[PDB]
């Protein structure tokens, strides 16, 4: 039977300072016991000073990042170029994820 999920491995890490925040992630991408890429970045600048990573099943990770990036674009189009605050980004990403509640994005997301 076709299994629509896979595990691309890797790990990510986010820490917040008083006037800064870091979002780190290794660049290794795998399937089973093989390496697909030694350098495949999964931490992205999404505009409005928001960095995002969706780690787990890369196809879902990429799809989510792609949708959120597109969300930021339209937020500007619909609300007079207003900056998307991190708290609003968070709330938007919740809806992106929960919208696929019964067929989930198989990822841990950190912004």
């Amino acid at each position: 039977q076709f299994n629509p999920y896979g595990d691309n491995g890797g790990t990510i890490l986010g820490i917040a300072g008083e006037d800064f925040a870091v979002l780190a992630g290794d660049t290794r991408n795998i399937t089973d016991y093989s390496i697909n890429s030694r350098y495949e970045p999964k931490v992205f600048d999404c505009g409005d000073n928001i960095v995002m990573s969706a780690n787990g099943f890369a196809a879902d990770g990429d799809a989510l990042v792609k949708r959120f990036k597109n969300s930021v674009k339209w937020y500007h189009f619909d609300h007079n170029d207003k900056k998307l605050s991190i708290n609003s980004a968070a709330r938007n990403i919740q809806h992106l994820l929960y919208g696929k509640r019964f067929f989930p994005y198989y990822v841990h997301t950190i912004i």
Partner: protein, 235 residues
């Protein structure tokens, strides 16, 4: 007959133009924007003395930071308000923030041209949308059934509008206090109204950053009416 979405030879939509005539028959609604807040006032205009005037609801809350006044076929405004409220609350659910007054106004105006052969005719009501957001501060918008909205420092709509607007052209300045605006709305309403203005046939409201949108009591507006009459007599 003829199509509902037909252009005139002068390049205008017949039904939109005709709905603008319906609005001119409506009761007067005036809005003035200050740096201390936006004031919204309306003429209630009870058709008969037996009608309980406080049940006339022509000033309405959209959200805590956004209020609205109406003029024309007021029954048409109910679904506009219902949409506005949902748009406002929905945006808060999706983004954990207040929706911009201009974004709200653009959302309501998106319903407007959704008629043809979608609803069967344009709305027969104009809206004054008044609110506050952190980006552009206090704002007043005139929303028309054409789908067009203009930002205004002050604006009158309805039967007494062209006279009241000419008055608002002389009276408005960029340093009006909220109290000054309140009195000005009362003064100009009294001028264009048919029956003699009092606390029962006119209503005041305002939106301030601090306390949000508030419709005034009949007791509060009565005192502002009294303060106004005393000030005009005082020179």
């Amino acid at each position: 007959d003829r199509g509902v979405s037909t252009f005139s030879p002068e390049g205008r939509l017949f039904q939109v133009e005709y709905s603008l005539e319906a609005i001119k028959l409506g009761s007067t609604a005036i809005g003035i924007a200050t740096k201390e807040g936006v004031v919204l006032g309306v003429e209630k205009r009870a058709t008969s003395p037996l009608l309980e005037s406080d049940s006339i609801e022509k000033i309405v809350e959209i959200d805590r930071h956004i209020g609205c006044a109406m003029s024309g076929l007021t029954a048409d405004a109910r679904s506009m308000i219902e949409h506005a409220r949902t748009a406002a609350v929905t945006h808060n659910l999706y983004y954990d923030e207040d929706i911009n007054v201009e974004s709200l106004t653009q959302s309501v105006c998106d319903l407007a041209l959704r008629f043809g052969e979608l609803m069967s005719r344009p709305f027969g009501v104009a809206l004054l949308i008044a609110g506050h957001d952190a980006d552009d501060g206090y704002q007043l918008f005139h929303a028309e059934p054409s789908g067009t909205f203009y930002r205004y420092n002050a604006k009158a709509i309805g039967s007494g509008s062209e006279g009241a607007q000419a008055e608002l052209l002389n009276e408005w300045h960029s340093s009006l206090t909220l109290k000054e605006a309140e009195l000005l709305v009362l003064k100009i309403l009294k001028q264009v109204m048919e029956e003699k203005l009092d606390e029962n046939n006119a209503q005041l409201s305002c939106i301030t950053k601090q306390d949000g949108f508030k419709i005034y009591d009949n007791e509060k507006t009565a005192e502002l009416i009294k303060e106004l009459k005393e000030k005009e007599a005082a020179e």
